[PDB]
Design a protein around this ligand. Structure first.
Ligand SMILES: *P(=O)(O)OC[C@H]1O[C@@H](n2cnc3c(N)ncnc32)[C@H](O)[C@@H]1O
Ligand SMILES: [K+]
Ligand SMILES: [K+]
Ligand SMILES: [K+]
Ligand SMILES: [Mg+2]
Ligand SMILES: [Mg+2]
Lengths: 523, 340
């Protein structure tokens, strides 16, 4: 175990902390920065850059600069969200095993295709090195945070990224729950309901917790894993690409340098508009050696993003309805993420809660890593942590597809984890030897309107008439929020039990070992 | 587990404050983190006892002591609940005994009783085969046995299971129920030979020669079945067994036979018939475990595998009460009054 570190693996920015001598220390990287861009780059000279160095050369080497991996992991190729992001990403995204893989020139002519898990593993490696420099020794174990609304595949993909970075991921912790610990650790005020509103670079969570002298109880959660800073930047970038088309007749998408130069300036302008009412977008040699000069007003920034900003209120109403709590039952609103500095976001939250000011106890950039580090301290077992207890939930209803494409629900959304649910099923035809167990995440009554978690082949069902075999299928969600599917013949049968194999649509143990070994040659 | 100990400590603090919903949640979290956490099982027992759930409190103290037999707190707690649970379980047997007498109190010229007994026969076959996954309907079963014609487009096996059960129940009621003397292995084999005879004539009336599995239960190796069955029937005919309340005896007989699982198949059907033979030999009506109770049935059988058969005894007692309530409701006479 050694020294267990807490890592906020963020869409745009990552952060690492360690619990030592009674308190959390957030660790500055080799540049003195307490947050690190979730960026990797391969220079023409074959040099692998991670963090500030990788982000800093984005505009001169865009094709071989990789980011946004957190919005690629645990997704299929044809996910509309993946296709959305491709339009604003400078690196090649190729279909491999019906999943988005990243193709880059690593140097000296030769290319390389990466799983998005491998990009996140590189970012985890950088955060680990950051901790190791500070600690002056090796780091083998970590707590890594994920969005509360992360699905099963996105959670496992984050664990796999940990494995590929040579980290033992002791626990996956939901980001709002981590932020709740950062808020609540120093509070000896008894029972409070807090509304954690976490709008990040890429994912949006709302979690309603009851916190109580060391107990962190998630009552309800609801979010969107593809809503954050990235989308606000894309809306502004698209506005100026069309404006440039309007003014010059030239299409900016013909140049990745131009598109990513706009992204860089759009980022700076967005941050400026959180304290100023306008920002000048200035790019030298933007496209075909011609300069770009425009103004972005706060009003225009808000107009371009108003539907997205307003949409952040839906999960707030959802957790209140799910919890059967009134607005007045919320004791504190806890804002997390750089995006919560956007005045219009603060205004919408404050107005929703009839004038109530959000709390100022937390750093919105460091709170998630702070919480990860505290839980890492607890699991380390040697840090004089108190009786800290997380009672977290699954964000999505888990079901099995039954005859007629029916969502047969086993585990409702907001069920406390770990949990176990069993149901007995039977065959649809005579002598059927197999169940094709299709597990779905979502709240809709038909599986076609829900998200496929995985396909599990159950074989060895003895020959019998249709609807006779009594096959108990069990869903177990573990303390990481990840599903295990088992099955049992409830009747008297032979020694040779029915067996379950997962779909091969997630990284195989062989594939992971290869990626571990490949990563060790840059470690 | 450090996490388990933290959850238990918080559970006790929340209980002290009167936050009982939160305490319950933390007890269950502690026992998820460490299912064999003796202190958590014991304290969760005391929590149950505060809610006047003596059976659950006692179940948890007993479970604690099966893990840690010399645990001082668990021993003191169990020693308190032991007599209270005996009082509760015996009181339920008394209520059942009163309802058996109410059935026997039904006048000899009650038309509804003969109707209900006939219907109850087909009902028993329906539930005993349907538990095992048989898809034949009550009306299809009545048709098979009365007309002796195959129901069209339904499997040979399912129909042959129903014929077997009918054959077995006729044999029991005509040859065994009224008969004086010990219940032998040969009697159990004759029952099984009828249960499985029309489906699997080779295996019908003989012990398995192979290892089988029974859901989560691993029964003895086929080589040990003869010896375990000899110990079983010796117990069936023992003074100790005949001093038990008939419902406890019938329930224990059921469990002991499915534990051994001496046959390749039909262990459930055979054991439910043996349970009803014991009840009827004691003057109790035959009882039905309904197919809808299947999950509860497996759950209490699993609790017995883990070393407490009492949930199974209480489940069989509840099935007995339900059978008696059904007979009594169906044979109620609604009096006619003079306006006067
Ligand atoms: P086979 O199909 O011959 O018999 C099935 C019966 O076995 C009993 N049973 C189910 N599950 C258990 C467990 N866990 N332990 C012991 N016995 C069990 C039931 O009576 C079935 O009907
Ligand atoms: K977030
Ligand atoms: K979205
Ligand atoms: K989006
Ligand atoms: Mg974040
Ligand atoms: Mg069977």
């Amino acid at each position: 175990s050694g020294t267990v570190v807490g890592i906020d693996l963020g869409t745009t920015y990552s952060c690492v902390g360690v619990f030592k001598n009674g308190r959390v220390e957030i660790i500055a990287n080799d540049q003195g920065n307490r947050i690190t861009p979730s960026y990797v780059a391969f220079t023409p000279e074959g040099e692998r850059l991670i963090g500030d160095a990788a982000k800093n050369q984005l505009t001169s080497n865009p094709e071989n600069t990789v980011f946004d991996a957190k919005r690629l992991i645990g997704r299929t190729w044809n996910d509309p969200s993946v296709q959305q992001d491709i339009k604003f990403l400078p690196f090649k995204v190729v279909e491999k095993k019906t999943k988005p893989y990243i193709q880059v020139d690593i140097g000296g002519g030769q290319t390389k295709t990466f799983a998005p898990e491998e990009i996140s593993a590189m970012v985890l490696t950088k955060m680990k090195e950051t901790a190791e420099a500070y600690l002056g020794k090796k780091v083998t174990h970590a707590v890594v945070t994920v969005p509360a609304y992360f699905n099963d595949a996105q959670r496992q993909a984050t664990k796999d990224a940990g494995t590929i970075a040579g980290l033992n991921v002791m626990r996956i912790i939901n980001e709002p729950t981590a932020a709740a610990i950062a808020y609540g650790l120093d509070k000896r005020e008894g029972e409070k309901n807090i509304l954690v509103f976490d709008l990040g670079g890429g994912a949006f969570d709302v979690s309603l917790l009851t916190i109580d002298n060391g107990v962190f109880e998630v009552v309800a959660t609801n979010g969107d894993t593809h809503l954050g800073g990235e989308d606000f930047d894309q809306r502004v970038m698209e506005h100026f690409i069309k404006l440039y088309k309007k003014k010059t007749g030239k299409d900016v998408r013909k140049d990745n340098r131009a598109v990513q130069k706009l992204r860089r300036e759009v980022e700076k302008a967005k941050r400026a508009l959180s304290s100023q009412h306008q920002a000048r977008i200035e790019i030298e040699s933007f496209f075909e050696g011609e300069d770009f000069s425009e103004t972005l007003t706060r009003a225009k920034f808000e107009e371009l993003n108003m539907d997205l900003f307003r949409s952040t209120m839906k999960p707030v109403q959802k957790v209140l309805e799910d919890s059967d709590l009134k607005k007045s039952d919320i004791d504190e609103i806890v804002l997390v993420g750089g995006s919560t500095r956007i005045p219009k976001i603060q205004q919408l939250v404050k107005e929703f809660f009839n004038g109530k000011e959000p709390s100022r106890g937390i750093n919105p950039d460091e709170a998630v890593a702070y919480g990860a580090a505290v839980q890492a301290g607890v699991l380390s077992g040697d840090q004089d942590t108190g009786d800290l207890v997380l009672l977290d939930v699954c964000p999505l209803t888990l079901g099995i597809e039954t005859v007629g494409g029916v969502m047969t629900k086993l585990i409702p959304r907001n069920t406390v984890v770990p949990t176990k649910k069993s149901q007995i099923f039977s065959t649809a035809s005579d002598n059927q030897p197999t169940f094709t167990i299709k597990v779905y995440e979502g709240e809709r009554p038909l599986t076609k309107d829900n998200h496929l978690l995985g396909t599990f082949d159950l074989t060895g069902i003895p020959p019998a008439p249709r609807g006779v075999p009594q096959i108990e299928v069990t869903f177990e969600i573990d303390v990481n929020g990840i599903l295990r599917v088992t099955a049992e013949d409830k009747g008297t049968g032979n020694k040779n039990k029915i067996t379950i194999t997962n779909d091969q649509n997630r990284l195989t143990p062989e594939e992971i070992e290869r990626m571990v070994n490949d990563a060790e040659k840059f470690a | 587990s450090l996490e388990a100990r933290a959850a238990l400590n918080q559970a006790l603090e929340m209980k002290r404050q009167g936050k009982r919903e939160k305490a319950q949640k933390l007890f269950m979290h502690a026992l998820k983190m460490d299912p064999d956490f003796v202190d958590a099982l014991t304290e969760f027992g005391i929590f149950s006892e505060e809610d006047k759930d003596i059976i659950q409190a006692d179940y948890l103290y007993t479970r604690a002591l099966t893990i840690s037999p010399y645990h001082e707190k668990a021993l003191v707690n169990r020693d308190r609940t032991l007599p209270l649970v005996e009082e509760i379980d015996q009181r339920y047997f008394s209520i059942i005994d009163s309802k058996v007498k109410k059935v026997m109190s039904i006048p000899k010229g009650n038309s509804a009783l003969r109707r209900v007994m006939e219907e109850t026969y087909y009902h028993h076959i329906y539930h005993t085969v349907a538990i095992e996954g048989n898809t034949l309907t009550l009306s299809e079963i009545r048709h098979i046995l009365e007309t002796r014609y195959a129901v069209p487009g339904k499997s040979d096996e399912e129909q042959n299971e129903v014929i077997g059960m009918h054959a077995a129940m006729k044999y029991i009621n005509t040859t065994l129920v009224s008969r004086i003397g010990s219940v032998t292995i040969s009697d159990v084999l004759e029952i099984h030979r009828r249960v499985l005879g029309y489906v699997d004539p080779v295996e019908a009336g003989r012990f398995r020669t192979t290892q089988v599995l029974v859901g989560h239960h691993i029964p003895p190796h086929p080589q040990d079945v003869e010896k375990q069955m000899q110990e079983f029937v010796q117990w069936l005919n023992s003074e100790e067994a005949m001093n038990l309340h008939p419902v406890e005896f019938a329930a224990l007989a059921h469990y002991k036979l499915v534990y051994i699982a001496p046959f390749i198949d039909g262990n459930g059907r055979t054991s439910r018939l043996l349970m009803n033979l014991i009840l009827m030999q004691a003057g109790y009506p035959p009882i039905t475990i309904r197919k809808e109770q299947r999950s509860d049935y497996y759950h209490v059988l699993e609790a017995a595998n883990e070393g407490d058969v009492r949930p199974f005894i209480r489940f069989i007692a509840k099935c007995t009460e339900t059978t008696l309530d059904t007979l009594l409701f169906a044979t109620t006479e609604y009096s006619v009054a003079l306006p006067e």
